[PDB]
Write a protein that binds this ligand. Sequence first.
Ligand SMILES: Cc1cc2nc3c(=O)[nH]c(=O)nc-3n(C[C@H](O)[C@H](O)[C@H](O)COP(=O)(O)O)c2cc1C
Ligand SMILES: Cc1cc2nc3c(=O)[nH]c(=O)nc-3n(C[C@H](O)[C@H](O)[C@H](O)COP(=O)(O)O)c2cc1C
Lengths: 137, 137
Amino acid sequence: GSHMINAQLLQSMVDASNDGIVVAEKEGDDTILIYVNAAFEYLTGYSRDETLYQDCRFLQGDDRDQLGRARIRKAMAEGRPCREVLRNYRKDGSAFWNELSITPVKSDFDQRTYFIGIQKDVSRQVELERELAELRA
Amino acid sequence: GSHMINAQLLQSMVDASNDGIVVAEKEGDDTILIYVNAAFEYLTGYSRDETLYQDCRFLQGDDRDQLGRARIRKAMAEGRPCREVLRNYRKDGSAFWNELSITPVKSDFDQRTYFIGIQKDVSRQVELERELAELRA
Ligand SMILES: Cc1cc2nc3c(=O)[nH]c(=O)nc-3n(C[C@H](O)[C@H](O)[C@H](O)COP(=O)(O)O)c2cc1C
Ligand SMILES: Cc1cc2nc3c(=O)[nH]c(=O)nc-3n(C[C@H](O)[C@H](O)[C@H](O)COP(=O)(O)O)c2cc1C
């Protein structure tokens, strides 16, 4: 993989990062979570066991009609990365805007595909874009 | 570290991510790079060997008078994470705004400290904030 650094050290650096970091394995139309760090649990409010081993579309809830889904689905199919923002809902019920940075990865040894995502609450930048759009009009 | 996923797989997921990812080890007033991924090389334009094993303050160049430095230095000293934006300069000479998400990590076995950072070009959001500040005035 990379001769520069020990893999265990890199894994601990990821576990402790303040950014949410998840890894997902493709299974047909779905993509199933296999790794979440502590930062992700804090961003979502769901426990590690509560959230693992399912497509994390459940964070969308009933707000299923969002333009971000399609561009994510189209990029995943094309095997290209993407960066889209959706409106997610925490376990306690809070609503926020989540910027998803998804990168498709293909392990040729297994001939299946994985995905790594880095999430960040950008609800501030969203509310600043809405304010700017209002002033422009 | 984490029983969920193989560390080598996680390392390859990091090597291939579209986000820039670096790991740095503290050495006194400096903090020295030990890991960079391919996305970081593309964001900066410097090769992997050109950039490793030095404090990546060199990306600031002569533009050394930036408020981001101090808040990063104050957070690193306090052992708390931070998210600051600086004006960096590529190897070709391009100027952009880089959002740094730095998380201090302490390996008690070695009794030294590491840092993991995730970088992203947010020059678009910066230019949208300047435009909004102008319209507000
Ligand atoms: C690595 C990765 C991270 C993702 N992050 C979650 C998330 O934080 N919240 C969310 O709303 N969607 C998230 N998604 C997207 C959904 O899992 C889903 O795959 C996407 O919306 C497209 O498929 P769908 O149209 O079948 O829902 C993520 C997907 C991947 C691959
Ligand atoms: C993980 C990590 C990533 C960093 N990213 C670089 C970068 O992308 N560009 C930059 O201008 N500063 C970067 N820095 C900050 C500088 O390395 C430096 O440590 C910081 O500006 C504070 O110290 P100084 O005031 O002595 O320069 C990073 C620091 C760490 C720990």
